[PDB]
Amino acid sequence: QEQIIPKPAEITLFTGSPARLTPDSLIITETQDKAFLDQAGQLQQMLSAGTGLPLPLKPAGQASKKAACIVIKKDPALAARGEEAYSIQSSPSGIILSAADARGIFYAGQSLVQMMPSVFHDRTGDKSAVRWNISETPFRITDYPRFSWRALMIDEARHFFGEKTIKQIIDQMALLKMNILHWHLTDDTGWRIEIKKYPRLTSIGSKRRESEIGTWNSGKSDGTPHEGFYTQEQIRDIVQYAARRNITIVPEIEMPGHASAAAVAYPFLSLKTPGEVPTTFIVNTAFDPTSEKTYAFLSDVLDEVTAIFPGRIIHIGGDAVRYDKQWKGVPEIEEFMKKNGMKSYADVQMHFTNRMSGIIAQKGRRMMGWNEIYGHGAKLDTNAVIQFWKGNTSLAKNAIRDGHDVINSLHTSTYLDYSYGSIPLQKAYGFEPVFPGLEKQYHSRVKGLGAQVWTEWISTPERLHYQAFPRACAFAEVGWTPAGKKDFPDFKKRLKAYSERMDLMGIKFARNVISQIDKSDFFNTPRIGTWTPATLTREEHSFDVTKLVKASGKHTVTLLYDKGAHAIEIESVALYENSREVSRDAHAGRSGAHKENIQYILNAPAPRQGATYTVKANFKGAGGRDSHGTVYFETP
Amino acid sequence: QEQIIPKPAEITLFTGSPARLTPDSLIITETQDKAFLDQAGQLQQMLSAGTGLPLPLKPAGQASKKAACIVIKKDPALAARGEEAYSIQSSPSGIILSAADARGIFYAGQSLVQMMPSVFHDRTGDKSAVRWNISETPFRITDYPRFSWRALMIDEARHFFGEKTIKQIIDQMALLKMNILHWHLTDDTGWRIEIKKYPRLTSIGSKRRESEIGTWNSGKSDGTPHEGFYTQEQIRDIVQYAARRNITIVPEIEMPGHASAAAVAYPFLSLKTPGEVPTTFIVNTAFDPTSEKTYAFLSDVLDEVTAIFPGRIIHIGGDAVRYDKQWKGVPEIEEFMKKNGMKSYADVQMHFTNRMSGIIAQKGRRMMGWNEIYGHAKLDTNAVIQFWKGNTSLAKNAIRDGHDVINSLHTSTYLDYSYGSIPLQKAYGFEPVFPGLEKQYHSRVKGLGAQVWTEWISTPERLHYQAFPRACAFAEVGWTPAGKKDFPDFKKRLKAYSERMDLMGIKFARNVISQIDKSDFFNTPRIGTWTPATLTREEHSFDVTKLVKASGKHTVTLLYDKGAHAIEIESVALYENSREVSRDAHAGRSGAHKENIQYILNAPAPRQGATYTVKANFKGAGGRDSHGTVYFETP
Amino acid sequence: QEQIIPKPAEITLFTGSPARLTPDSLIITETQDKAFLDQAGQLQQMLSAGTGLPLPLKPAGQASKKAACIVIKKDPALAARGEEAYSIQSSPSGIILSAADARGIFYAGQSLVQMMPSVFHDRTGDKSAVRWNISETPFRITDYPRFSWRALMIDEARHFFGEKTIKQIIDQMALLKMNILHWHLTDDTGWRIEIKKYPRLTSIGSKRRESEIGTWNSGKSDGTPHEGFYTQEQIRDIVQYAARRNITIVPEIEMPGHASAAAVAYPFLSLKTPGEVPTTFIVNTAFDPTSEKTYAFLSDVLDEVTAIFPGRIIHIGGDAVRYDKQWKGVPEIEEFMKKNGMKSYADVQMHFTNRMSGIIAQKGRRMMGWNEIYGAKLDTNAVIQFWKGNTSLAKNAIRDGHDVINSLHTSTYLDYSYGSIPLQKAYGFEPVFPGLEKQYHSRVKGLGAQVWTEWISTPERLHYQAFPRACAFAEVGWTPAGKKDFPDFKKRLKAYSERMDLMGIKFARNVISQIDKSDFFNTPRIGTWTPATLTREEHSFDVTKLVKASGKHTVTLLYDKGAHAIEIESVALYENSREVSRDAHAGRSGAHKENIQYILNAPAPRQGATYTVKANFKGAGGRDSHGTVYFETP
C-alpha cells in the first residue's frame, strides 16, 4: 500500500489501476525554468538507471496516449509550503510532478522511487520483466516538511571514512529527504580539512599512532596508525554531490575545546599542547583564549572554510572546555581574568565564543554551536543558532524566548553512537523536537533536529551503518511527517520494505531491530484485559470485545508481558460468538523478557446483532505466576 | 488443475502443455442456432473483461491456428444427459465447448473460468501480467448434473436485502452451477413483492417499526425501522438477470401460515390479525381458511405472480400453522371442521393447500410446498413436495402418488444454523436420496435445496457468512456423481475456490475451510496408536515394512482421539533397518487443537529384505491422559 | 558465483543485467572447423528442444544484433588447458562460446544449461512463460578440468538394469562433465556381453534362479529369477550415445577372479566350476591360470570386446582371487607353481594378469586393473586403479611409468550407506595420494566412484545410492583444489536437485542436511558440555576472537558420547551485555540429531568488545551427556 519514508503530509487515494512506466514512457517538462530542466535531466538519469527504461526527455511527443508519462510542472500555489514542497498526481493517464521550487521536484522523484518495486536498486538481474507500477492505485500527494532542518552529523575526526563512504551516506539521506549534512571534521584525535595557509593541520593533525578501542578507559588499543583528510578539491566535489541531492553541508570546526590535533600542529594555539596527537578519546585540549594569534589563526582557517563551503551556517562546536584540566591555574588564564574582570572560567569561554560570532559574521556567515555558547559575562549574538544537546530544556527554551533559532539534538534521544539499549528504535521515532513546556507562539523557533553519529568506536563503514541505521530512518520521519500523522507500528512495517532498499544499496543496518514488538506499538490500540499472578490461578481467560467487533475481518490479539519474574506460555487464542467458537489461532507463544510469537490472528465474522464477542486465551505462567501483562485487540 | 467445484462427472487427463488465451485468441461460433449465438455474446463479454483480452467473435472459418481459439459447437450426442450437459476439449489447437442446449455452453464457460487464474475476478488487477492458461495439461471433460434441481433459498421477508445483493448471490450460484433461486418473499415480518391490485401489501406490509435481534424471545430489539420491497419492474429485471445465468426463480408466497404482514394490510384475511406488522419473529399468523374472500385474494396475488415470474413452479410454503394459537377453539374453525367432516386442525390446513394447488394448476402452473401439503378438493398430482422432515416412508408414498420430491432435510440444509449445528462436513455428506428408499423411486428425487433464513441476518456480509462455504458443498452434492464425492479433495478445492470468493467480495466463514477431520483417514493405513501407557516413554516405533513399496513422500499423521492431554511432537523419522534415512523435525501438537500434526518422510527406493520403521518422539502435554492414532499415507 | 556443478575454474562477474535468449536469438559459428560446425548443430538441437526457442544457425555477417546471439569460436589459446577446456563471455550483446577443441564446446553447452531456468529439463513444461536468462549478470568464464579421468562405474553384473537406465545415468554424467563410464559387465552372478563365438556366456551366464538379499550370507533370498544382457548392437548404440556426450566407455571383463558365470557356461575355464550360476554374492570362482585354453578363450572374448568397444582402455578387474578357496591344494596349481618356481598364489595371479596385459597390448589396447595387477612382465602402459590407500605403491607405480587412478574404497564405494560415506566425505576426497611428492602428481590422472549392485535391484535404488554423492565426485574431478568449498556446494546441489527431479533421478533426499563430527575437523570449537555443565540451563562460550565480520554465523551443538541427549531451546549472540541476535527454536542433540544448528546475525564487530554465545539447553532424561560446540563464520 503506502510505503514512503517519510510519510507524506497529505495523501488522497482513488480507486482503479495505478500508473505504470513502460519502454514507451517519456518525461515531459512543461516549464522553461532551467533549474527545473536540470532536475528533470537528473531525474531521467536516475530513473533510467534503476528501471532500465529509456524514459527520454522531450517537451513534445504530446503525452503519448496509453503510455503514462512523467510531467514536470512549476506550480506557484505550493510556494506557501516552502521550497521543498511538491505534489504528485498519478494515474494511468499521467504522472504529474509539480513544485514551486526546483528542489521540490527532486523530492518528488525520491517519493516516486519509493512507490516503485524495491528491485529498482538492484545492481544485477533482468529488470525488463518488472511491472514498474507507481503504488497500487491512482493518487494525489501534496507534501512538505514539518521541519526545515533535518540533519545527520557524521564524525570523521574520531575516525576518518572518506569520500566513497560519505557519498553513500548522502545517498541514504536524500532518499529519506534529510537536507543537512553536519560535518564534524575537527577534534582532538583528528583534523580532516586541508587548510592551504597552514599545511601542518593535515600533515601532522590528520595522522595518529594508534586508537583506543572498546570504550573510554578500556586500556585497550589497536596499535594501528590511522590517518586521512579531505583535500579542498574533494570538499568542493562532495559539496556539489550533496547539493544536487537537496543537501546543504554545515561544516564544524571545533573550538575552543576539542583542539588537540590543531595544537600539535601549531603548539602556540594551546596553553597545554600535547606531545603528539592523542591516541585515546579522553583527551580534550583547549585553544588559548588569551592570545590574539589564536583568533587570527582561527579566522584564517574560517576564511578557507567559507571559500569551499557555500552554506550560510558555520558550526564552531563551542561545547564546554574541561576548565579544571585545561585553564585553571594557568597564569596566562588567571591574569587574563583579573584584567578583564571575569569571575569564572565559563566567562572566559563566553568571551571567546562571542568574539568568534563576530569573526564569523564579518565573513558573511552565521554561527552555530552547542548550547554552551548561550550560557550556563555578556550575552550571545541573537543571530547565532543553538544546537541543544543536554541539560535542562529550560536552557533551550530560554534561548528560544530570547530570539534564537534552536535545533533539538537532545543526546538521550539522538546520539546514534549509543547502543540500541540506550536509544531503542521507538525512542528515536517518538522524539518530539518541540520542547513540551514551550508556549505555542514560540514553536516556530524550533527549526528541527539533528542526529549524531560520533565515531570513537566506529572504524569501518559497516559499523557506521550498524549504528546510524535504522534509527536515522526514524529521525527522517520525525523531521518531515506532521506530528498528527506519526504512527510507530505503521512506520515499522514501512521500515521492513525500506530495509530491502538498504540491503540492495549496501547499508549494513542493525538486523535484530526492525521487527521487535514494544509497548509503544499499542498507544493507538484498544486494551481488552490484563493478566496478574491472580488471573494465572486459572488457564482459561475471557476478555470482552463485543464493542470492538463491528465488521468482518482480521483482528490481531497481542499478549504483551509488562513485568514480573515469569513469562507466560500461550497455547491458543480464540474468538467466541456468544458461547460458540468462530475463530482460533493455535500456536505456541511465549511473552516475557523475550517475546516469541505473541500475536494471534482472529477472523471475525460479520457481527450477529445482539451477540456477545469474547476473546478466550489459554495461557499459564512459565515456571511461576509472578507475571503481569496486557492484552491488546487490533481492528485494522 | 482439477480445481472445479462442483467436481465434473468425467475427466480424462493427457500429457503436454495446456491451451492459453492470447490477445490473438478468437471466439468462433460453429452453428447458426440463435440460442448459442446469444450465449456466445455472453461468454465473449464476460471473458473479455475478466482476462482483459480482445477475444473477438468471428464467424466460423476465420480461425487462425496462431492462437488457440474458443469453438462453440452444438453436439446432439450430449442430449442423453439433459439440457445442462456440455463438453470441453482443451489443447493448444483450441478449446472446444460443445452442448446440445445453449444452457450447457454457459456452464462450460463457468468451468473455463475455474480453470484460469483467479485474477480473472479482480476488477482492478494487472491482468496483462497473467498467462491465461486453461488448467495445466490437455484434457477432455464430459460434464452433467446428477440432480436436475439444485436450489438455494434466500429469505428476504425476515430481512430485505435488495437488488444488488441478490444479483451478487445469483453470481455465486451460477459459478457453482446451482440452477434454482427459491425466493422467499413473504412471511409474518414482511411482504416484499409489489402487487398492483392490493397496494397495502407493500405500503403497509413492507414496513415494520423495529426488529428483534439476537434470537427468538431475546427481549432485545434494534429500535430501527426496516422497510423494503421489489417493484415488478425490479423483479422482471432480476428474472432476466437470473435466466441469463441458467437460474430459474421459484417465487414463494407463504400460506396458510406466515401471513401477519398480509393480514395487517388486509385484516379480513385472518381470524387473528395483529395490530401492526410484528416486531418479533415468534408471531405466526394464519390466513382464514373458512372464508371465500381469502382464496379469491390469494388467487389474485398469484395472478400477478404468474405474470412476472415465467417459471413453471410456484412455492406456497404450506408448512404447518400454529394450530393451538391460531385455530383451536375458534368458532369459525370448529364449525368448518364439523361441516367438512374433519377431525384435526391439520385436516383444515390440508384442505386449504389442496384447494390452492388447483387454483395454481388452473393458472398453468405447478404448486410446490413443504411436506405438510402431502397426505396419504385433493392435491394436484403435479405438485412438488419439498421435505424439511426426515420421513422416508412419507417421501416414498408421495413418489408412488406421482410427486416429484425435493430433499431439504433441515438438520443438514438450514444455513441459518451455526457451524456447530451443521458443520461443513455434514453439508457435504448430505445425500438427497432418502435413506432406505427403494431404487425404483430414486428418479423422482429431483434434487435438493439449501435454505438461508434471515431472522438473524441483517447485512449482505452476514448473509455470506451463513451461506458460504456450505452452499459450495451443496452445489457439489447436487451436481457431482455420488461415487466421485471426496470430502478431503473438496476441502483442497474449496481452499482455492475461496480466493475467488475473496476477490468477488463474499465474506464467507474463514475458519471452517481447511480443517483436518478424522473421516479423512477412514481408508488410510493405521500403523499405531498412543495411550497413557505409551506416553511413559519419549520414543515410539511403528512398523511400516509392508507399506514401503516405492520411493517418495510418505505422510505420517498423528491424530488425537480423546483424553485430557494433547501430545507435543518433537520429530518423526523413517528408519531403514537401524539407519535413519529421513526425519521431519518440526514442532507439532495434536490434541483438541491441531498444530502441524502431519510429518513428511522421504522413503528410499525400498531395499529387498530390509525393515522400515517410523520412529516418533512425542510426549504428553501436561500429563499422560491422551489417546490417538497414527496414520501412514503412501504417495 | 554461478550455480554450476562442477564449479568452474575461473569466474569474473560484472554488474548489470544478464544475456537473454529470445525467439529472435541465433547461433552463429565464426570458425570453419567442421568439428566445431558439428558440435554447433548438436548444441542447436539440444538448446532449441530444451528452451522451446528456434535458435537457428546463421553464418557470421548475416545477423541482426537485436537480441543476444550465441557465437561459437575456436581459440587455440585454451589448448594449454587440454581438449575439454572452454570459455564463456556473456552479456546482453552476445554469448561467446570458445574452445580449442570441439569437446570444449559441448561442456560450454552443459554450463549454459545449468545457468538457465530448470524448466529446460521438463519435456512438457511451459517453456514460453520462461525468461531464458544466462545467470543473473554479465560474466566471463574460463574453465577446464583438474583431472582428465573422471569416472563413474556401474555394476550390471550383480543386477542388470538395461539400456534405458544406463542412458539416463549417462545423461547425469554428461551434465556433470564426467567423461568415463566404467562398465562392470561380468562377475560371478552374471555375464552381460553377447559374445558370438561363445553363445553360452549369455544363454547360460546371463540367467540365475534367484538372488540373495539383505547382506552376504544372510540365508535370505527373493526366489525370483533374474536375467538380462546387452546385444552387440545395443553395446554399439550405447557407446555412440556416450560419445555424443563426451564420455568414453571403459568395459570390464573380470579376471582371473569373479568368473563363475563364464565358467558355468564353459566349465573348463575354472578348476572349481560351480554347478549353476551362483545365487549368493560370496561365491568367487577363479579362472584356471595353468591352462592355455583359458588364455585362448579370453583372447577370443577380448577380440569381440575390441570390435564393439572402441576405446583404448579395457579393464580386467584383476583384484585378488580367493586363493585358499579356489587354488590352494589344487593339483594343477601346485604343480604349476613348482614348474615355474613360484612361491605364492599371488605370483600365479600376477603371471596371469601380466600375460593378459600383453595379450591386450597386442590388440592395440591398454589394460587397466585394480592395484593387485601392479603389486611375464606387466605392460608399461597399463593403468592402475587403487581401491587401497597405499601411497608408496602408487608412487612406485608412477615411477615405473604407470598412470594411476585413485578409488580409495572407504571414500568412493557408493554401495555403502550414507553413514559409512556421507556426502561431505565424498566431496572431501583428494585423489592425489596423501604424502605423494609433487613430481609424481601429474601421473595421478583422476578418480573413479563405484556403484556395486549386490544390494541394488532397481533403477530407483541405483539412483538412491549413486546420487548425490556422484555430484560431489564430479566436482572433485573437475574443480581446482583451492576453489573447493563444501557449504557452497550444498547450496548449488539444492538447485542441481531440481534438474535431477525433472530428469527422473530418485536421489537420496535427506543426506544434504546430514551432520557428522567429520564435518567439523576444520571448524573452531568454542566450548563443550559435560555432566558437570548440565547442572544449569544457561551456558556461555566466548567468541571474541572469532567475530571478524558482519553477517550470519552458525553455532552447532554436536553430541559426542554419553547415555543422554540435550534439549536445546535458544542460542543468542551478545555484544558485551547487549543481546544482538537470538535464534529460538527447539533442537535435540544425541544418538539422533535435530535442528542442532543455530544461526546468529553478527553486526560489524566493535573493536575491543567481547562477543559471547549464550545457549539454553539441558539434559534429556539425564545428564550423562558430552558434546562439542562449533562456530562457523559467514
Ligand SMILES: CC(=O)N[C@@H]1[C@@H](O)[C@@H](O)[C@@H](CO)O[C@H]1O
Ligand atoms: C558536544 C558533544 O557531544 N561532545 C562529545 C562528543 O564529541 C562525543 O564524544 C560524544 C560521544 O558520545 O560525547 C559528547 O560528550
Ligand SMILES: CC(=O)N[C@@H]1[C@@H](O)[C@@H](O)[C@@H](CO)O[C@H]1O
Ligand atoms: C552527554 C555527555 O556527553 N555528558 C558529559 C559531557 O560533558 C562530556 O564532556 C564528558 C566530560 O567528561 O562526560 C559526559 O558524561
Ligand SMILES: CC(=O)N[C@@H]1[C@@H](O)[C@@H](O)[C@@H](CO)O[C@H]1O
Ligand atoms: C520474564 C521472563 O521471561 N521470566 C522467565 C525467563 O527469565 C526464563 O527464566 C524462563 C524460565 O522458565 O521463562 C520465564 O518464566
Ligand SMILES: CC(=O)N[C@@H]1[C@@H](O)[C@@H](O)[C@@H](CO)O[C@H]1O
Ligand atoms: C418450514 C420452515 O422452515 N419454517 C421456519 C422457517 O420459516 C424459519 O423461521 C426457520 C429458521 O430456522 O425455522 C422454521 O421452522
Ligand SMILES: CC(=O)N[C@@H]1[C@@H](O)[C@@H](O)[C@@H](CO)O[C@H]1O
Ligand atoms: C486435550 C488437550 O488439548 N489438552 C491440552 C494440554 O495437553 C496442554 O497442552 C494444555 C496447555 O496448557 O492445554 C490443554 O488443552
Ligand SMILES: CC(=O)N[C@@H]1[C@@H](O)[C@@H](O)[C@@H](CO)O[C@H]1O
Ligand atoms: C576390487 C573390489 O572392489 N571387489 C569387491 C566388489 O566386487 C564388490 O563386491 C564390493 C562391494 O562392497 O566389494 C569389493 O570388495
Ligand SMILES: CC(=O)N[C@@H]1[C@@H](O)[C@@H](O)[C@@H](CO)O[C@H]1O
Ligand atoms: C544419546 C541419546 O539420544 N539419549 C536418549 C536419552 O537422552 C533420552 O532422551 C531417551 C528418551 O527416549 O532416549 C535416549 O536415546
Ligand SMILES: [Cl-]
Ligand atoms: Cl527358485
Ligand code: NA
Ligand atoms: Na499510481
Ligand code: NA
Ligand atoms: Na506558560
Ligand code: NA
Ligand atoms: Na572345470
Ligand code: NA
Ligand atoms: Na558478551
